[PDB]
Structure formats: structure tokens, C-alpha cells
Amino acid sequence: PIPTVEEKWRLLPAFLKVKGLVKQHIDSFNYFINVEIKKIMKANEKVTSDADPMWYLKYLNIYVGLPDVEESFNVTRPVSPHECRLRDMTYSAPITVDIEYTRGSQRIIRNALPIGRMPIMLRSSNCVLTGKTPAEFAKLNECPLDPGGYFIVKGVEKVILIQEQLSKNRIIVEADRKGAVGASVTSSTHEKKSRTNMAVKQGRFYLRHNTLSEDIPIVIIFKAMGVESDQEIVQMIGTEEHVMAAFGPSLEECQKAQIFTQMQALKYIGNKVRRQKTKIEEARELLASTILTHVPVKEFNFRAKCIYTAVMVRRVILAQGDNKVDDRDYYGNKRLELAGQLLSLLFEDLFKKFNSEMKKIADQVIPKQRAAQFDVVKHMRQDQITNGMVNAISTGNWSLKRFKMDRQGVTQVLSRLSYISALGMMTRISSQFEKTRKVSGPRSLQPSQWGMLCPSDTPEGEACGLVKNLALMTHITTDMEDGPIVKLASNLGVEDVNLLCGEELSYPNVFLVFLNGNILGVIRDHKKLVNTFRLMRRAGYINEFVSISTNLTDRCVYISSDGGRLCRPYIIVKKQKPAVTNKHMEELAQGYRNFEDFLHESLVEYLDVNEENDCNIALYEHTINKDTTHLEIEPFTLLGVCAGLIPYPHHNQSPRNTYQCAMGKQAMGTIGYNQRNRIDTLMYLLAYPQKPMVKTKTIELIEFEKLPAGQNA
Amino acid sequence: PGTQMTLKTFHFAGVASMNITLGVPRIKEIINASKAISTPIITAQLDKDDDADYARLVKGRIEKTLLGEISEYIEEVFLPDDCFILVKLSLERIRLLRLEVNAETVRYSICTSKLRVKPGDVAVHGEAVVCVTPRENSKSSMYYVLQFLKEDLPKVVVQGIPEVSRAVIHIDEQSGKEKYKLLVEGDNLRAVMATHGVKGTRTTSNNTYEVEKTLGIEAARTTIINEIQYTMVNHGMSIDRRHVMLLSDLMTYKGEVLGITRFGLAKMKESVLMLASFEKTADHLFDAAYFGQKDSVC
Amino acid sequence: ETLEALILKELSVIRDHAGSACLRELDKSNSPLTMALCGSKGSFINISQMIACVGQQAISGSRVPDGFENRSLPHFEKHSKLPAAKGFVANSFYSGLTPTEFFFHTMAGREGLVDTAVKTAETGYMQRRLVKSLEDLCSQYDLTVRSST
């Protein structure tokens, strides 16, 4: 017998109270209109004309107010969501900015200048429907059980589906019809996405890029980057007898061609590349910040780029000749995208377009002028931004020429068939892959996903895995910084990459540090490093959403801190025993020691998909061994929202489970508390809904017993 | 039958680890009648079916054996005089494989190699040691061709057929009799069937194009029926014999084995209107008006 | 690979023995046994899976592959070549499946759902390729089959 605590089932409601099921869709927007709206503002703040350098614009601050409507004339009154849903209006609020323009000779600072409108969420912080009471919710004709999270544009409910994509700033090593090939996709904060690939054929490496015409040997690029001596090249590649025998052809090919100096290498690159200012300068600028944008250069030093390319060559060497390849179905690398980043790109593009438009309308009026004062307020319109936002949300065709991207089918009409179909629409996630019959891996159930995406929840038909839903316990990490992280890393004793040479990285004891696809440096004793980092994370100095893992096959530590990662809370164990005791849960039952206090007292912690790869997790408490590091809170959390309505899911078969998950959103029943007031296109009601006798804990968690869609017979 | 023919490897077990596609892919390749076939398997029988030592002797005959795998060790010796490459042929590995390759056989295989070499500086020192001196001419120095001849010495085949890749012998048992059947994985049947070991009379192939090139067009209509029936009995289904006999005679009456593709359908039928739906925007439609052929409505 | 098949047949013997011992203890009035004997809708494998044990959940005729680091699930150990660890289900449908066993049973559920959902496209390609080829082959009145020409 082992001391068991049958009280950890009340941790899940306390965790769902703060965030979880549908609140993250609102946190993605609340953090967006408080940080990213200011980020794009400080991005583009000063614009100047070209006629005479005396006129210029400045921005002081920008913010968004409350949902308002402009009626007949000079009347701004608070509008209700049901009012817009009945009048086929659009739920939006104006954007108030503080502008500064210099007309004539003096400077004018006109505060509170309206430049446009912007939609507001139904349950956001700026909306009215927040922090209210059910008695007050009934006064506004709105269902209190409505989870929200959709957009109201022209009297329809539109939801933006979460879309998964591949991670950027990383090296992939795949296999194709010829052999093995390495690739690197890079996308920085500014608008430039690149995809370079190293290919191998008849024992000769070649580099391919979109702006390059023909393939160029990697040794030529090495000599062009700045490393002159050919010995240091092989030294950086790898200190091994079998990696040197595979690098011989490249060396003899570089020796065959009359290329021995950096100038000759740059001349060869200029002759090879075609762009539609001499050849040396364009070849130098093409290698600086064009092929790899995620690796910054201080002035003209290609040392870090050389190190990264050497690690890439060593990776493609260790891959070739073995049976190890990297697959894209791994969910530890695949990232998620909510409605926040799409709106960020859209708003940035619209703001840049608006700044470039007025710059062009006021440049041919200053020379051909008839007055001495030119006001920019009269030559200003606020209809383009609102029209663009409304059309982008309604149509759902994200078209961004500045980013050079076109996407269709992102926003969908919120299905109001039942109470489960409406909530289940908010948890739906679509993939970027098209309707391809040939692909079967991504559609197939992957061992990587465990408690993050419900396996049973999937549509039956053509889409047999492309559409997935989230689990009950799931959290998406937001964006953060890297200053304190790199500071603590340098204080731990990490060595700089500019000090050691190429022969040290081949040493087995030597370990490399990777941070968001960037080589931080070299460190010894990585175990103590990871231990101290985890201790500091449990302390409270560094944020809790920082992932750190190690790879012994590649001999490097990965530090992931970018936004859009998957994590679920796990209980910590102390060498034979869970830290959570009965006295800690009695206080939670009392009303104190919430989830925040538990996270601050080093009781539970979040883990990533790749972070749980380097740890042992126990299902129950009787299975806990001496090697387990974390403990599962509840095992019934793996099932999804539509899968929580099936009595005894383990007793039933997976095809029947999937069928019932698909038919649960098809059953008709009660929609909400105000179904006679709302007027939708098609609506179904039942007469006398009964209550399920054998209910589930998930039913009570969502309070499905108040709006059942069936009857006992 | 093809509707319910979408399952995975059926007779999968550790007894026979042989990757042979059977299902809708095999039927699709048979209907398409493509030249290049996937996973070639070709079976032959021996004259001596009692002794297994003869089977092991003739197994090494039809098999592509390289020089580097048989060579004990190769080394480059450098001295004040001209350097040369030295390879030590191991006789024990030849005796264990029961091969009939001697030092003169290696010399003749090297002189008949594809890389630039002529019998001027290639000699045998003793029993199973070969010395090759590279020349200094016509491309570059001898140092660069030295690295070029050391990585192709294993590539130079010493015996066998370059077409055949892998061979294994299968044991058949009965009431009291034992049989040994030699199945190899290649394409050139004309070379394996014309061998002293395997009996050329009793030998079956899988490539329809190669078996109609070697045996004939009339002998290809029989092997295309057996492969189809062998795929239908592997699924637990049953078709009639003349149903597939009529399909085998449909691509055998006019010329050679014609496949059911977009190009073969134009050779079978001569109607532009039915090809209008198969092909693209306006190519055939304008070439028809250019040439001016008469379409028969039948 | 030799060891993967040596223990694969030892896990089937216990299942077959349980299924055969269940038949001697069953009554001659059970509806499932009656339907299996008649053959209307069911089989003996379903009875042995619902009563005795499920068996082994194989994927593409192989064992459950690893997905994190040389291990299928993170709840197991490193390089754990154990039957119950990799893909072996022990409890039947009546008793109750383990979440790890439920995941392995659901893994085989989707592999069979995706091979019939896309099979319509290949079957339609082959049907159009075969129909357009043979649409005029008929028999004449002199016991001879000819073409349209």
C-alpha cells in the first residue's frame, strides 16, 4: 500500500477558473491590444515628406476605447451586442491616437484624433460584457452561459479557427527520391522569409536558394564568408576520420577552381548570382543578411554564420550513411497560430498602407500651393481601415502583399445548432495541409500528442485527421523576451563562441546551447546547467513558460521561449513522493492556496512536448517509481469536450467513439437562455429536455445538465 | 474486387522477409503494363535438386560480387621510387563463398573496367596479391587519379551479372522429397536462364515487358493471367478465367503488350472526341483542324 | 527482428488458449454464441475479444513505433522491449481498458478509417481507366467477338 491522495481532482476546476477552455482566445486578444498595438506603433512612428525637410509627423500614444456607435449626428451612446446582432450592425470601437503635425512654422499637437474603428471581442476587457452578474446579464438580453470568443460583423457570428504551422529558425534533415537533404527556413521580425537547402549528390555538397541561379559548393561560400585557410574549414566541420573522407571531394573541387582569395570567391558568387554597385558588393550584401536573416551580424563578421553552417554540415554528414531522419509530424516543433498574430499582421499592413498613402497625397500640393498653412486633418479619411478590417473578417481571405501571402477559409460562421456545437467550434483546429489523398502520416494518430489533442474527436469523411480539437487541460504560451534568460545563461558560465576554435565543438564532452534557433555558445556539465535552470524557473525569477531540453544524439541543449507552444500543468514528485499533500489541498478546499500560490510555492509546473521527452511521468500513484519526475493529475483529462458525453469511453470502441463525437454536435436541443429573442436563419428547439441519469464529471465541468439536448426513455 | 483491395501487407511474417507489393498497386502496374517494374522477383529450378552443395555452388555463379568486399585490404605504398596501389586478395573468403575467381581473373576484370586503365602497369605479384601502378597523363597528375581509382576498385565487379542484386535459395518439402528453388531479384532473365546451374527450361519471371522481349508476345499473355490470379487468391476473392483471358487478349492482338494509359489509349482507339476529355486545353483540338482527319461515329 | 517475432507468437498463444477455454465454460443459450454459430452477425474472434482479452494491437503489420526518444510513450522506460509496454493489451472490454491500452487501440482505429476514406479516389481512377477502355467489345452472331472498327 502507498499513501494516496484522492483530492487532486479539485485542482482542475481551480485551473480552469483562471484560464483554459475558451479564455485563451480572449487572452490572445487582450495581450494583443495592450502590447502588439503599441509594438506596431513604435515600429512606424515618424514619417517625413520629400519636397522640403520641414514637415514631419509624430505619434505620441495609441489606444482603443469602448464599443460605440455613431448615429445621426454627434451622438455616441454605448451599444449592446444583442442590439448589433438584431440590427445586423458590426461590434466595433474607435481607435484614439495622439498625433503631432508641424504646419506652417509652428508645431501642432492635436490630442484625441480618431483614425478608424476596430472590432472588439464579445467577452473582452474593453467590452461591456465583463465582470457583470447574471441578473445584469439578463438585463442586456444575453446568455450568461455563452462562452464567447467570436466576432460580430454584419449581424453574424464569425470564429477564427486556430491554424497549425511548422516552426521557423530551425534545421530540418529530410529524405527524398535521391537521398538526404537539409533545409533551413528563416523569418525575422521584418518582412523577409527565406528557405535555403543543402543537397548532396555524388559526394558533393551544394547550396540552393530562391535568389540563386545555379548551385555553389559550400567550400566556396566558406572562403567567401571570411575563413581563408582551408584547414580551419575542415576543423570546424568535424575532427573525425570518416567525416574527413566524405569532405575530400569538396576540398579537391575547391582546389581545382582558381579560387584562393576572398575577392575571387566574391567575384565567383557575383558571376553566379543573378538579380533583376559592382559584383563584389552585391555578392557581399547577398551573404550578409539575405540568405539567413535569423542570424544577425554586428558589422561584417560572418563568424556566427560560419559556425551555424558548420553545424549544419556536420548534421547532414551524420545523417547521411545512417537510418535517422527528421519527420514533420512531430508536434514538439509544430506551432499554433491564434487570431492574434493574424490581426497583428493585418493591422501592421493597414497602418503602413495608411502612412504611405497620405505621404503621397501631400507631396504634390506643397509645391503647387495657394496658401501658407496646410492642415493634415482635413486631408484624412477613417473609412479605409474600417472597411478593410470588416471585409477581411467577413470574407475571410487574408491577402497581404507586403508579406506576400494569401490564405482562404480562416473565419467560419459560428454554428448555433446546439450548446455543444457552439463550444466545440471554439476548440476546433485546422491544418495548413490541403485535401491530399496521398498524405497519411499527419492524418494518422501520432504518439507525440498525449493529452493535448483528443484522439477520438475527429470528423468522419474526407477530413480524417486534418481537423483536430484541443484537450481539457491545454495552454498556449504567449510571447516574451530573452534578455534576463541570456543574462542568467552568461552568469551561469556559458562560454562565448568567438573564443574557442573549430576543433573544440567536435569534442564529445563539449555541448552547444541553442535558444530559439540561435547558437548561444559552448558549455560543459550540461546536467548541472539544466538542474540550475529548472531550479531558477521553479523559484520565480524567470517566467514559468520557458522550455529547456537536451539531446544526446546531437549533443546540444535546446532552449525554447517563443510564443505558441503547448503546455499542461504537471504535479512534481520528490524522489519517492508527490509534493502535494492533504494539508495543501485542504486549504484549497477552504478557499486559499489557489493555483497561483501552488505555482509560486514550487508544487506544480508546466512542461512542453519536447520537455516531457526528457522526463519520466507516472499515470497513477501506485505506479510511481524512483525514476519518475512528474505525475499525472487526472487521467480522464485526455478526452475532449465532445468525447466527455460518452458513458464509459474505454468500454466503447474508437470508431463508435468518433461517431458519437461527430453526432454530438448534430443533435438538436436548447441553445441558451435567450433563444426566443435572438433571430437566426435556422434554429432547432426541443419540447421537454430531460436530464442524463448517468452523467460525467466533464458534463458538470461545462454545466451541460442545464441545457441538455436529449431525453431519457 | 479492387474496391475491397485497400489493405496492407497480408502474408507478413518473420518466415519470409520479402518486400513484394500485392493488392491495388500490383494490379495497377499490370493494367498500366509499364516497362520499369517494382520489386523484381524471378524464380528458377535446378537440374540437381537433391544435393544442396550444388545449389550453393550455382548460387554464387548468378550473383554480382564486388572486388572490395572480397579484397582483404588495400594500401598505398610510397617510397623514393614510383608509388603504386597494392590489394591483397584473400583466398579464405573465396573458399568460404565457393567462387572461381583467381588473380588472373581479377586482372582481367580490372583491365576490362570502365575507368581509364590499360594493361601496362597492372600485375600480379604472387598468388593472391595484385599491384597497380597509376600513369601520369591525359587528365592531370597521378595523385588525383589515385584517389579516383581507390574508390572505384570495389565498384568494379569481379563476377556475376551487374543486373541481379540479391539471391536466396528456398527449400520445398513434400512426402519424402526435398527440392531447392533459386529465386533471384533482377531483370535480365536472358543471362540467368542461359546458365549451367539453373535449368533454363523451368524458369518463371515477373516482368511482363522483359518476358515478352525474351520469350515472346504469345508467352506474355499467359504470365499476365497468372500474376492477376495470384493477386486475387491472396485476397480471398474469386474471378472467372475467361474474364481475365479476354483482358489479356485485348492488349495482345494488335502489336506488343500495350498498356492502359493515356498514350496507349490513343494507339488503341482513334477518336479525338473521347480524347478531348482526357487531354488538355486546345492541343489535340487544334491539331485535328490542322491535319483534318475524319472521325467515324461508331 | 528475430526477437520481435519470437515473442509475437507467445502473446498469441495465451490469447488463443483463453479463447478456447472460454468456449468450454460458455452456455448453449448465449445470444452471442448462438449468433456466432448461426453466422448472422458476429464471429468467435469478437467473442474472445469481448470476454477473454483483446490481444495485440498491430499497426501496418508491425509494433507500435517510438515517438519521443527510442520509446513509444513517455510513461515507459528507455529501450523497454517489454510486451505490455510496447503494444500489448491485457484487459478485455468488460473489465476496462487502460488509458495506454486505449490509446494503442485508438491508434489502430484511425489506420482503418483513412484507408477507406481515400480508397474512393483510386477505385474511381481505375474504374474510369477500365471503362473507357472497354465500351464496344461485344459478341456477334457467328460466335466471334470484334471491335467497333
Binding site: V413, L414, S415, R416, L417, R437, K438, P459, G461, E462, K665, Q666, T681, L682 | S34, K35, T261, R262, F263, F278 | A117, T120, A121, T123, G124, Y125, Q127, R128
Partner: peptide, 30 residues
């Protein structure tokens, strides 16, 4: 004979259309 793909070359017919019913709720004539 060129190495083409059946999917992109042969355009989808009524054969390819898999008639299956799913919930997907929510020209001049004389």
C-alpha cells in the same frame, strides 16, 4: 512516356467524388 502523376494529369471525375453526407449547415432561368 513521361513520369507524370495520375492525380494532377487526370482531372477529378464523378468517379472521384465520394458521395457522403455531412452536416454543413450554418444564373438565368426561363
Amino acid at each position: 512516356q513521361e513520369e507524370y502523376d495520375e492525380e494532377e494529369q487526370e482531372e477529378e471525375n464523378d468517379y472521384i467524388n465520394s458521395y457522403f453526407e455531412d452536416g454543413d449547415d450554418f444564373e438565368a432561368t426561363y
